[PDB]
């Protein structure tokens, strides 16, 4: 089967990085592993242009990148991209997508290394750290509800990793209602009863949001 | 009341911009007037050095003092009050604020908003709002569960306590409990006392590993 990668995209993505904008670091990365046979930015209709010039000014000409549009939400870019993929070269039953924040420009190649080989034996795949903190209930904003049970608690980040026919097969079965909200693609799955299998993450695979964040950014570059 | 600061200290000793991480830590309590003594907890092995380290970057302060510490952290949270207990004896409305030695990053209004806190409602936690995506695991190999994260926030500290109420609680706890228990504010959670939150930073981290020291010359 074919093995894509679905990057998915001020807009924090432009932000300048050590002079270069967030994104050019994050496919950068991606552009490193030789198995991709094609790597899509999925980027809101307005941004397309923009990012399009963005690569040509900091990667130049690379056959495998394509800028595609997105949707009204995440799964909807998701789907989108996977939507452009069946038009161009056919969706077969083996084929996995590899999607991930343009805004991590910090996973390595153990990380995408380990998505693919997981996404390729188990169809769904999430990348997530230990929870360091302890996790704390409140239903009123003000007071403690309940302190809940650690029994392996995890901090989901991203790549999260697919089988192109299964993620597709279980977004249609959602109703119109669930997708309003359900911005997680592996919540899918897990909803759905499939077994989403975690590849570990690294503390340092952050998503660049606010501008402390970018503070982190620098230094952890 | 009487008010009280309880540093819970090896990491604490690693240098943050050429002072080690528990002098930062410290000097946000000693800004604050409002402390009649700020306890430093500290292993018998390590209050030598602790001193040490004190007397060199602070230089004499009545306020601070260094304190052996106990078994495990919950000890040594009672371990500093034992000290109080001896060396000023407590009366009920007596508050502690407790908080990590590798948290250096800790504010001002973090600081001033846990203490009244503790004076109205006897037990607070400083928290944020849970941002990334929370997932469990029974087996730690494929994903059991994603929870909804409306009200999930992850815990920071200072955690601070009306003394007298917190050891009275502590006490009323099993073997059992306390064995597993890591979050002292649990200790007033599971007897159904309120617990009180104030809002921390996305910046109040812990630094423990080599990796950590570098986002905190960052921040």
């Given at each position: 089967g074919m093995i894509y990668a679905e990057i998915l995209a001020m807009p924090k993505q432009f932000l300048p990085l050590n002079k270069r904008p967030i994104i050019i670091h994050t496919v950068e990365k991606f552009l490193l592993?030789?198995?991709?046979?094609k790597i899509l930015i999925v980027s809101p209709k307005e941004w397309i242009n923009h990012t399009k010039d963005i690569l040509k000014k900091?990667?130049?000409?690379?056959?495998?990148l394509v800028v595609v549009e997105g949707g009204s939400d995440r799964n909807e870019s998701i789907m989108s991209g996977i939507r452009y993929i069946e038009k161009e070269f056919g969706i077969q039953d083996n084929d996995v997508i590899i999607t991930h924040d343009?805004?991590?420009?910090?996973?390595?190649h153990r990380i995408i290394d380990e998505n693919i080989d997981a996404v390729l034996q188990y169809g769904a795949v999430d990348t997530v750290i230990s929870a360091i903190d302890t996790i704390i209930a409140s239903?009123?904003?003000?007071?403690?509800?309940d302190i809940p049970v650690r029994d392996n608690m995890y901090q989901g980040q991203t790549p999260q990793s697919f089988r192109i026919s299964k993620l597709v097969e279980l977004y249609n079965k959602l109703?119109?209602?669930?997708?309003?909200?359900?911005?997680?693609a592996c919540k899918i799955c897990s909803l759905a009863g499939e077994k989403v299998k975690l590849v570990r993450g690294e503390?340092?695979?952050?998503?660049?949001?606010?501008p402390y964040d970018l503070k982190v950014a620098n230094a952890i570059l």
């Open positions: 592993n030789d198995r991709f046979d900091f990667i130049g000409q690379d056959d495998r343009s805004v991590r420009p910090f996973l390595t239903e009123d904003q003000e007071f403690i509800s109703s119109d209602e669930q997708k309003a909200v359900l911005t997680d503390v340092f695979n952050i998503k660049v949001t606010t």
